[PDB]
Amino acid sequence: NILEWLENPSNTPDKDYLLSIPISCPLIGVIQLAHYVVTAKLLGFTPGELRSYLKGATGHSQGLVTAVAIAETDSWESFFVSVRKAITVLFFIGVRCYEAYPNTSLPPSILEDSLENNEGVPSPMLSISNLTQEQVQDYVNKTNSHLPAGKQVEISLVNGAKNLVVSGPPQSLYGLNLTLRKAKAPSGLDQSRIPFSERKLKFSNRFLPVASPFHSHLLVPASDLINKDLVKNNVSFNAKDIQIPVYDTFDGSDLRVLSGSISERIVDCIIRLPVKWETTTQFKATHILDFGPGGASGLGVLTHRNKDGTGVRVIVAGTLDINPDDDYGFKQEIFDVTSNGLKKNPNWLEEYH
Amino acid sequence: ELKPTVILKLLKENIIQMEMIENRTMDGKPVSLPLLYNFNPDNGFAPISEVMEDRNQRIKEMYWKLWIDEPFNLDFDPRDVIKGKDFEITAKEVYDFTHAVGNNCEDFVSRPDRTMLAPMDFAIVVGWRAIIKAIFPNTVDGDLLKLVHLSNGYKMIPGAKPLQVGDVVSTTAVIESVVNQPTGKIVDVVGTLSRNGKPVMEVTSSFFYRGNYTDFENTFQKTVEPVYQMHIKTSKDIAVLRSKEWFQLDDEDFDLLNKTLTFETETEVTFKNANIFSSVKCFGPIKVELPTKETVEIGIVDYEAGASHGNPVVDFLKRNGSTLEQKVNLENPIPIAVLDSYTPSTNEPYARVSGDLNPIHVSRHFASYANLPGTITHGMFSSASVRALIENWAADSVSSRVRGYTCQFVDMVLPNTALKTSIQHVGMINGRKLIKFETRNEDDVVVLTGEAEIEQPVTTFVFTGQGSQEQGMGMDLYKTSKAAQDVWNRADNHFKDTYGFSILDIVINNPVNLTIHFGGEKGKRIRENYSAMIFETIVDGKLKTEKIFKEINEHSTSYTFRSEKGLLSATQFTQPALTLMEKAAFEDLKSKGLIPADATFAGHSLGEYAALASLADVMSIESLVEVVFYRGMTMQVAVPRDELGRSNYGMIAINPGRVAASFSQEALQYVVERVGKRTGWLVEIVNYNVENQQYVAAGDLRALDTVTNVLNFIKLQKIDIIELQKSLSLEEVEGHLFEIIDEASKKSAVKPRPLKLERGFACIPLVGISVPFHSTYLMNGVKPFKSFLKKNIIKENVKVARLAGKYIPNLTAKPFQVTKEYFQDVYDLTGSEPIKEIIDNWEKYEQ
Amino acid sequence: MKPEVEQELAHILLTELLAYQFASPVRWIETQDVFLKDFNTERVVEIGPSPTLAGMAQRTLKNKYESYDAALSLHREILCYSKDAKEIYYTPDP
Amino acid sequence: SIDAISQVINIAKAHPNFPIALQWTGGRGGGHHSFEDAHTPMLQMYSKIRRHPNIMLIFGSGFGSADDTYPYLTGEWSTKFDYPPMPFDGFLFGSRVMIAKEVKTSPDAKKCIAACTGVPDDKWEQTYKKPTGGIVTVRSE
């Protein structure tokens, strides 16, 4: 009862329940569609008009559903058709994926150890910053050798050259984290007086605030059930209805050039296939509008970090705030009618040629 | 939706019927309780009177339809066994049950490549119909609307694995006790869940019919009495026991003097009235403690009386014996957690999964009629809910660890109550932790108390061998612990009485020499024991008995044991002393309830003897110290000694990683074997302790000094053996190592015979070791020692259950098993005629 | 196999195991591997006057089980009776 | 180091109209040297430096020709590390000019310098242990 929760903050369930994917999947869809509508309405565009100004759309994990949905949109009358399809895909992903891999209580000894070692509350997705994919894949290979098949972890998101996410059982990832906490040097270690090549590699690892292992073998059983639920509730995405390119999160190809079902591919990209974020963002653009949730903690700022010095300006479309560095934009930059609306980020090759 | 709950009308002219309707039923059809009232308008002040005739029957008929899926028949005997129908545990029932009680433990959740368990709480679902049928017989006449559930408890049968999805579980229930108390009738029910014929767990439920009951002919009480122990010290104690008719030895001429007896009695009682019994039966085995601390049956208690005010058997045993308490309290309770939980807004989900369709939990009208504060939470919901917390916190979410759980339903809970459960570790019972919990409501009122028995983490005991001994070892424990005192005192007495020395004196004072005097009658008896101490060898089918202590004859007045530094270092004293310190430590742990029933164990060398006496009780204390004293003497005889008691033999711990990073255990094996062959002296790798970090070389003190100097030279030259033997030259390394060995051997041979072994870079000498333990030098000792072991290890004391899978021998580093494969592997390691004969003839032993 | 026959064979096996242990090497590498790996023991309690085998288990774990123990998230307590009485008896400091 | 580059940035921020020549050298430079890689700290700090238009970014250490400096001038150097191009504003040449005619270096010291083979950037850290390309690291007072 989201309307009840929004009217009365007292009657809103606890964060753990909200975070569970049967709730969080469709509601993150709704947040993104809501930001898209606020954007379109304050510009006096129809959804299709705002869509027509876009060279392309894509999304990170379940964002890819919202990206295909807004790619289909034309008028305010038929917008709720696209909203329904998106909400329905995300409902069945949330529900089926939760049924395939429900969260269970984690041993309190594991929780106590993770909190005393300034790691997160364990979760099915661990983010590793400042290690290469090869390095992370070596540590997951070591962990996976000992573990049996149904407990094995895998690289789920390649967000950047040194920004990786590992999915699998929270206990299996706590196991990976024990292996990592040996290999990592203390944060307040001075290595300035050590030769560069002899330094102990320092990196970050935190559990993500998520409740399901997206992009993992654990959720693969849910695939067939989600596909059947979509054919039952009459949710398809036709290439000819998708007016802008929508980039696949695995190979960065346009979803419109698929032979098979786009809905089946999108489901596959969310539940099974890893997100290769630098591969999917290979498109040429001066501006990137980040509708997704998280404001400055969202996909926009991640994408900025990957694209810094190529002449791409990210705008965080969902948050009004002030960036002191002014290296990416907020909401106000979309609507500004003065020169402040058209800020270009530096391309170093051109600027210092 | 809106449904009829009550229908009030006139049945006949004068009979008011209030039909109470339950809509939440087994088959969906509503069930109606007709409450009947007389209307007598001649009594204007109170014209309505309840029809009390058949009222408990009418209530039972309703509850029967709601709870039991059988024909309504209250004419069965409360003494008879109740047979519940077979129950198949499905994933769907486990899912529904765990959600209903808020149990999020992963063992109960479907996961890939992994079998789904049922929680032990699931036992009430399987057993409810059998268990609850016990409060229904005609002779157990009570008002089910006033039924209180006092207590519930689960107990896993030792060895039994937890319930799983797929398991077909059969249930039996028996009424243990039904007794009329001043305030109501208590019914104590015991359910037994079985799977594949074998019993898995016992469910204990206590129910209370609030009321005034005086039908004492239908009451009875079975009590399992606490185990009583008597130490029979005097002949007066024996006479007092023989004066009791109930005390009935199997063998009347059995010798009770100095024996410890245990009485394991059960009391069956029938009542004439509240205070006087109409019958008393007290029966059960009387057991004597054997020297191994095993108890065996020597007779029965068999008491049978009519009208009585008491049980004289138990009164006697209380006054004269001591109570054996399985539960042992910790010094201080260890707080585990203070946990918040909630009762659900509705009791229908729990009602559906449990089959407990009691209207008082779901129907406002029944709860009102029953005078309750509202539609109270199922006590069994609160049980399962607090048990899920215990399982999570106390058992670290390993559901298999929870072996028993009992809860006392102290007070009723309303839906949407916030409960606070304090969980504490308060004691031990048989290796299991004893967890106490107390659940309070928002008003700080105790609603639920109980306890759980949680298996300790998987444990191994490892028993140290020789080298570890020091003066005073175990003497702090000996002061404090009664268990440790009994071990030491029994061994000290055996040594004093048999060999004329105190093992305690040697541990405490570590004398350099010890003279044994053979004066007087006692001295001649002790001298005989030293003389009768013989090696029993078989040579050409002939018994050739040799003497240990050659210098002791019938004209000897004394014998002096000799040492350089102290006799605690001499192996015939070290062995008993270490074995006792270890057995005393272990007996203290056992006394405190700290030993898991399924612990594994191994001992390093001598440690193996303490381990076997400790965990398996294969030998008595006396047998143990005798066996290891002999073992030590066998080793002392095998080794030449000087006047001061010094040998030309020793041991070095070699770290192959401390010489060179490329120097492996195959390189060490090679070097040691070459230093042995070149010099002709004794040196072998005997203890494999830490892979690539600690190997022990035993033998000739010169060979050990040579090996130390060779490895010191190899470390300083930084020269590899394996790289040269494979990539440079074939068998040249052998010749090259010979001259390095010769350099060290020439310097070692010059040194005097009692040469002090020096600490190398890759070698450290083992202090207080003078025998080449575990070398082939001691192989002559095996046959006499084997014959001695065969005499002193009695086969009746070998409990396979206490060894099988648990004991890891040093010889065959594999968990002990009585299989052809195990025997064959032992034969391959050490060829022996008895084992070969067992392997060949294995088929006749199987049948 | 009958209980009394199994007992007889167990007696013969045990007498032979102990008899030969005298003059056979101590395979404590393989023993530690059996109880640390094949049983995933969480509490190793060393019963002795000094921590020799505790030291050995602590070094075996560091040398060949550091990744195994991390991966399976199993916490080993290596307790010696002589030093770790409080942990073995469950008598922690107030 | 990174921290010193941050301090240079703070000075540039405080005097936004005053030209700051940030002369970046790695540990591979002649004379008193750091433990720092030449590339890694530039890859981390280049973006933050280029936010300050008054900072003129000079790359030194290890350079002796047009060929070896050209990739730093065009910015293509940073592409080998999967970063966008990162052009530099100029170069410094310490070691390279020590055998020039007008340097006071004694003839036999010039012959000694010339005879040093040097090593590529991947091997420079061997100077801490042993002679590497005829060069070694020693400690000042």
Ligand SMILES: CC(C)(COP(=O)(O)OP(=O)(O)OC[C@H]1O[C@@H](n2cnc3c(N)ncnc32)[C@H](O)[C@@H]1OP(=O)(O)O)[C@@H](O)C(=O)NCCC(=O)NCCS
């Ligand atoms: C050998 C033994 C004494 C080593 O245990 P310890 O005293 O705790 O020794 P440690 O390895 O912890 O270190 C103590 C010091 O002794 C020395 N040392 C230990 N092992 C050594 C070796 N193999 N070679 C040389 N020096 C050694 C070192 O100086 C070491 O200091 P370090 O840690 O800086 O290297 C002990 O493990 C032991 O008694 N093992 C043998 C058990 C046995 O097989 N006996 C039964 C006989 S049948």
Ligand SMILES: Cc1cc2c(cc1C)N(C[C@H](O)[C@H](O)[C@H](O)COP(=O)(O)O)c1[nH]c(=O)[nH]c(=O)c1N2
């Ligand atoms: C002979 C000699 C002497 C000095 C130096 C270097 C050399 C080679 N360097 C460091 C110098 O300015 C510059 O940073 C490095 O030389 C650049 O590295 P390359 O030597 O070109 O590889 C140096 N730097 C500085 O700031 N003051 C100085 O006095 C010196 N002295």
